[PDB]
Design a protein around this ligand. Sequence first.
Ligand code: CU
Length: 127
Amino acid sequence: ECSVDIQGNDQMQFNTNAITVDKSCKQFTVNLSHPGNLPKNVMGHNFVLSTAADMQGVVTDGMASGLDKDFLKPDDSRVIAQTKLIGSGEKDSVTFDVSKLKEGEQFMFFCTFPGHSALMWGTLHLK
Ligand SMILES: [Cu+2]
């Protein structure tokens, strides 16, 4: 209820490709964890939400803002929600206002650690 728990693992994958957010949620929370034993600088993960059309841009630029910036460009107005980059045995969360989701989609989530978005992406939808 108003939350989803997402794992990114040592196999460069998330546990789901699809998130639903109920419309009667004021806020929605994403809880990210990283089971496994690989460290952040070789298999780090984060959770980033944008519109599908902004995805490409957000990724290309995170790639370059580097590891210290969570592979995210700071002040990226295109990012609706984001976590920090985490490694094995770490966690992170992000809570955001569901009004930020223009009742019209289309939204995708993904990891911006370099190369990962090939495997680590999914959809988020209202309802
Ligand atoms: Cu990743």
